[PDB]
Specification:
part of a larger assembly; 4 chains; A mainly alpha (about 100); B mainly alpha (about 100); C mainly alpha (about 90); D mainly alpha (about 80); A: about 100 residues; Histone, subunit A; 2 strands; D: about 80 residues; mainly alpha; 3 helices; about 5% strand; elongated; DNA-binding; nuclear protein; Chromatin; Remodeller; ATPase; Histone
DNA sequence: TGCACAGGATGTATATATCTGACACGTGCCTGGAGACTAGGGAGTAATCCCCTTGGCGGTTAAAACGCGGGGGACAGCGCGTACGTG
DNA sequence: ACGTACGCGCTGTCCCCCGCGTTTTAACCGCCAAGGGGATTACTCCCTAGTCTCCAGGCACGTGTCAGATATATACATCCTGTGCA
């Protein structure tokens, strides 16, 4: 496939066929699914390394949704990117007010 | 000599207890009869899957938690620790509703 | 019946980043909803951005300015750098 | 007949403990119960809309997730 | 008669065989990977014209800026009691 | 059922921004006429991918196998009881 010669992991044919059958435009370029798999691979690698270190903080070798919830909410760009997204079984942040102490 | 806590202690350890738990705080059967009750007058003789009930209960629980946090900050702005009805109307209206 | 997911790809990038920590099934479904959502984000922004220029062709320019417009400057900067690196290395 | 009273007062007290609330007044359970009563109509009405459009007698998880898709909430997890 | 002792009758952590659950490996039919023909949509250019500037003198006007008096409203101190905290 | 303590009502304080009069400046006009570059319209090639096509192969699926939790022999281990004694 053309993903290995370009340094990609996600396939180009599935994204290109999904853009063809997704009713977006008449003509589809050849570098657009490569760019899309590059952006999705970098972002998915970012969530994988942030949730991976968040799983490394609580001394567990498995990723629970609370680690992904704290990994997304603890980052500013992920909270600004996704502010309305509700994560199931992720819990909330330990936010304790100062005046209630 | 009875052993009693002062008012304001058990709420803090209830915050420490429930804030570490990801479980649902609403039972399945009153939410089931409630969802079927709202679904009664819309379309008669409907069916519900075993899924898609903890999704409504999950979004209701987390959305109500965020509403209690925004309303809690609204009660913090009033320089008191008690939540009032005008805090729910204030934090409900100021979110765009 | 057949279904399509990103299990082996997320497991492969997992083996590329930290090949010790495993992933649960539910968080894998959350990541599938994440990639499936951002795919509709950049795809829909590419559709409207292609509709704004009175053109019927979607190229890497629309994905580049679309990523530059819907993301913060860090994620759009490194995503634009790595994306143009993968595209220019591909061509 | 009156399944809105199934939500107990210690349940709203525990949901207030999740939000960081120390002291709770009397009308909070009635106001929260009314907001929940409007919310379940606001989501459930769209669920009956997509269920009626889908030519189905049973509501699925895709009906709930796609029902919350257009409202900007984007509920993940079950049926994504 | 008061007393220590040898062996049974029950417990109890300890070690061993056994029951789910999830990671790992071996396939093959609906996917991708790739070759060639067409052509219209994209890249490039030649006037164009049209509203948009370039730089700074004065006279005057309406709007912006300053200044003080003080009045009423924000704000601190303090007692009460009943309404939720705790059991 | 008890309880106690913070929301609330009341009172005294003081101070800070509103109302209005006086000072200072931003902008429009007259002079005195000129060009200028950037989207627009029209024209003209040119070459990237839709479409058709066939060849290959790979990730969803089925099975092997160990990790972790589970239930049960077992070798002593502590009260109880005959039981013989000084």
């Amino acid at each position: 496939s053309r993903s290995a010669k370009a340094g990609l992991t996600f396939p180009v044919g599935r994204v290109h066929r999904l853009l063809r059958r997704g009713n977006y435009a008449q003509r589809i370029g050849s570098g657009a699914p490569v760019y899309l798999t590059a952006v999705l691979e970098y972002l998915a690698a970012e969530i994988l390394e942030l949730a991976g270190n968040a799983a490394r903080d609580n001394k567990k070798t498995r990723i629970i949704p609370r680690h992904l919830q704290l990994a997304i909410r603890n980052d500013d760009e992920l909270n600004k990117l996704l502010g309305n997204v509700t994560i199931a079984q992720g819990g909330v942040l330990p936010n304790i007010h100062q005046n209630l102490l | 000599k009875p052993h009693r806590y002062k008012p304001g202690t058990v709420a803090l350890r209830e915050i420490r207890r429930f804030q570490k738990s990801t479980e649902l705080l609403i039972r399945k059967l009153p939410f089931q009869r409630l969802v079927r009750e709202i679904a009664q007058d819309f379309k008669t003789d409907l069916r519900f899957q075993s899924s898609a009930i903890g999704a409504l209960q999950e979004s209701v629980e987390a959305y109500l938690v965020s509403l209690f946090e925004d309303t809690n900050l609204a009660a913090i702005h009033a320089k008191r620790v008690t939540i009032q009805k005008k805090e729910i109307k204030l934090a409900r209206r100021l979110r765009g509703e | 019946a057949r279904k399509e997911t990103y299990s082996s790809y997320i497991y492969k990038v997992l083996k590329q980043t930290h090949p010790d920590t495993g992933i649960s099934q539910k968080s894998m479904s959350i990541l599938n909803s994440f990639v499936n959502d951002i795919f509709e984000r950049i795809a829909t922004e590419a559709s409207k951005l292609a509709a704004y220029n009175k053109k019927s062709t979607i190229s890497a320019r629309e994905i580049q300015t679309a990523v530059r417009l819907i993301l913060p400057g860090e994620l759009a900067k490194h995503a634009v750098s790595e994306g143009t690196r993968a595209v220019t290395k591909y061509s | 007949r009156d399944n809105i009273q199934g939500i107990t007062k210690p349940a709203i007290r525990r949901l207030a403990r999740r939000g960081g609330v120390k002291r709770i007044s009397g009308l909070i359970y009635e106001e929260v119960r009314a907001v929940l009563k409007s919310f379940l109509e606001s989501v459930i009405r769209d669920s009956v809309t997509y269920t009626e459009h889908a030519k189905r007698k049973t509501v699925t998880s895709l009906d709930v997730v796609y029902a919350l898709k257009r409202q900007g909430r984007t509920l993940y997890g079950f049926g994504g």
